[PDB]
Structure formats: structure tokens, C-alpha cells
User: Which sequence fits this backbone?
């Protein structure tokens, strides 16, 4: 009921928002989120919308407390529990309650393009052991940006899924040592060395 | 356009279907799916709906070929690429094309209840090395049914998320050796032994 905010996913592609997400959004008094998240959810031009610049603890704490006086909704791109706010949330002394509303992630869109099951991979957010180890039992699905060190991947065949569902969507294939990254919205698929 | 079927997710909870899923569904000439998947998507009483009993290769091959003459849609519970048809699809000599439309999985709903990121776990579909190995770098999120051998898990603390978003939804906590499973819709959360 009260003394709590919602963190809702905006989805990845247009028309991926859920009936529950819209209801939560429709009721909110103030909506926080990055411009992409707001745009995606179709509320970047709403008057209740505040575009977030930062996403650190301090900034989420502010939003958090304001949620005691008013109904707050935070929109995250894609799915909230995929390379989302989880981590910093654990660092916040929880007075107000927080509830998560799932949405479709770039991870799901990529898996759908590849015809690969989630139980066949390990989702990585952008280690040493995360290479040989995980690759021993799983393909890797890495959420990367243009600064991902491909080095750290050898001569392995990789599939780059760029800007899924965006104007410049591209799927490329090649070897980590001879392919260049160019988009900050890049999912890197690495088949398990079986 | 043609010579291809869609496999769409019905979601997990009511109101989790996407605008694209509905459009695909609204256009379909024949709809296949298990009763839960059809019920969830709100089409179990549609005249175009055929409730699936089996989900083996032979049965999907049939549906597949019928998709050459008519517009076919197959609805999977939750998300299609989570413990879905991926595996048997790889065993089918692909004439007709298949496209996947993502939906919200029980995996996402569980992660949202736990406030845990997908990049922090390994999703398991119901091994020896899948225990100590994966648990060395990830929590485990196991999609289980009432026959999951808890043995195969020791004295580890586990969290059981049962019937998420269903009448009998329950979240229980305990040790694998002293807790009993009772639902075929059970997600088993095992924190990484860190
Ligand atoms: N449209 C897109 N196409 C490809 N990758 C994307 C993407 N959107 C996000 N990503 C990946 O996701 C990363 C951001 S972390 C945010 C992910 C989001 N919450 C979700 O569930 O999708 C990016 O660095 C990129 O690797
Ligand atoms: N409502 C629910 N609550 C808890 N677990 C569920 C569930 N629905 C499905 N499951 C899990 O999913 C398994 C079926 S495999 C099908 C999963 C579905 N495609 C999805 O994306 O959710 C069950 O054995 C159970 O472990």
C-alpha cells in the first residue's frame, strides 16, 4: 500500500511493457528513470517524469525517502534484476519497502535471436575464473559496452548482438582477437568450449 | 511473412503478456499450447486453440509443417527460452522458420522476489559438477518439480519459491536435508557457498 516504491522494467523493444507495469506507472505520482528507460515506457514527456543522470547509492536513497511522502516509481531499462540496481540496493538501510516489476531484458531478446536457453548460459555483467571456469559448463552471455576488453577472451569465436530492437541493430560474428566493438549496447555470446 | 511459425511466451502472472505477443496471437489461425499456457494467455476457450498434451519432437514437427499452410502460433508458459523447446528444436530439420517472442519467466518473478540479479546466478533446468562447480561462482536458481532429489544438495540452506503468482503461492526456507518438496512449480534458490 504505502511507504514503498516500485522499480519497474521498461522492456527492451517497443510494446514489451506489461499490464501491471502500466498500472503501476499510471498511478505513480513521480517517475524516475534514465531517458532511455522513460522513452521506452512512453513517459519521458510526462510531467511526473524526472530523468535520472546518476544511479549511485546517494541518488537512489533520495528517491527512496521521497517515496515515503509520495507514490514513486523508478523505471529501469529492460528488466530491473539484470545488471540492475540490485547491488546498490543491498547497500541501503531499508526503511521504505521496495517491490520489483519484471520486464523483458536484452538478455531475453538475445537468447530469442540465438535460439538458446537461459539454463544453458551464464549471464555476465561486463573475472579471470569467469572465463575458463564458467565456459567449462556454460556459454557466456556478456552484457558489455564498447570498453569491454576483448583480449580477455582470446581467439574465441564470439557473436555480438548490438542495439537489439534499436535503429542500428546488428548481429556480427568473428574472433575476439580480430573483431572490434563499437556499441555500448552489446551482448557478447561465447559458446562453451565443449 | 510466411512459411514460419511463432513461439510466444504467455508470461507467468496475469497481465504479463506483451503488445507484440497479443498481436501475433490475434493474427494466428491456429494456436497450440499446454492448457496453462493457453489459460494464461487468455485463449484456452478460443476456437483456434488446440491444447497440447505432448511436447516431443514428433509433435512439434507436426505443428511445424502445418505452419506452412496456415499461420501458427505456439504459446509456451512463461518465457520460451527458459527450460523451453530450444533443445528439441535443435533436433528438427528446419524447413519452416521459427521466431521466438519473449515473455516474463518464473525465473524473473523469483529473482524479483529475492532482489537478486540474473548475473549473480546460474539457472538450472531441474549434474554432479553443477553443484560444487557452479556454486563456486554463482547462486543456483533451479527450476524443479516435486521429484527433484534434494539429496543431491546436502545440508545447504535452500529457499523454495512455489507456485509464484498462483493461488497457492508459497515461499519457504530450510535445509535441503530437512525440507520436503510438494509442488511441481518449484524454484529452488541456493546461495553460493562463498
Ligand atoms: N538493446 C540492447 N541491445 C543489446 N544490448 C543491450 C541492449 N540494452 C542493453 N544491453 C546490454 O545491457 C547493458 C546495460 S545493463 C542494463 C540491462 C537491462 N536492465 C536489461 O535487463 O536489459 C548494456 O551495456 C548492454 O550490454
Ligand atoms: N509459477 C511458477 N512458480 C514457480 N515455479 C515455476 C512456475 N512456473 C514454472 N516454474 C518452474 O518452471 C518449470 C517448468 S520449465 C518451464 C518454464 C517457463 N517457460 C518459464 O519461463 O517460466 C517448473 O518445473 C518450475 O520449476
Assistant:
Amino acid at each position: 500500500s504505502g511507504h514503498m516504491i516500485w522499480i519497474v522494467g521498461s522492456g527492451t523493444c517497443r510494446g514489451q511493457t506489461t499490464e501491471r507495469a502500466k498500472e503501476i506507472i499510471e498511478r505513480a505520482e513521480v517517475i524516475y528513470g534514465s531517458r532511455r528507460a522513460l522513452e521506452l515506457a512512453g513517459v519521458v514527456d510526462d510531467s511526473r517524469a524526472r530523468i535520472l543522470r546518476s544511479f549511485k547509492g546517494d541518488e537512489i536513497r533520495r528517491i527512496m525517502e521521497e517515496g515515503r511522502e509520495r507514490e514513486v516509481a523508478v523505471i529501469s531499462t529492460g528488466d530491473p534484476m539484470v545488471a540492475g540496481l540490485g547491488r546498490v540496493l543491498r547497500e541501503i538501510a531499508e526503511d521504505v519497502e521496495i517491490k520489483i516489476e519484471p520486464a523483458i531484458s536484452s538478455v531475453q531478446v538475445a537468447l530469442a535471436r540465438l535460439k538458446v536457453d537461459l539454463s544453458e548460459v551464464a549471464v555476465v555483467d561486463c573475472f579471470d575464473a569467469e572465463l575458463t571456469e564458467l565456459l567449462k559448463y556454460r556459454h557466456l552471455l556478456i552484457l558489455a559496452d564498447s570498453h569491454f576488453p576483448l583480449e580477455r577472451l582470446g581467439k574465441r569465436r564470439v557473436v555480438l548482438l548490438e542495439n537489439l530492437c534499436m535503429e542500428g541493430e546488428r548481429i556480427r560474428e568473428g574472433n575476439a582477437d580480430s573483431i572490434e566493438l563499437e556499441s555500448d549496447y552489446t551482448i557478447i555470446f561465447v559458446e562453451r568450449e565443449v
User: Anything to note?
Assistant: The two ends of chain B are 50 Å apart (CA to CA). The domain at 1-105 of chain B is CATH 3.40.1010.10 (Cobalt-precorrin-4 Transmethylase; domain 1). The first helix of chain B runs from residue 19 to 27. Chain B has two domains: 1-105, 106-194.
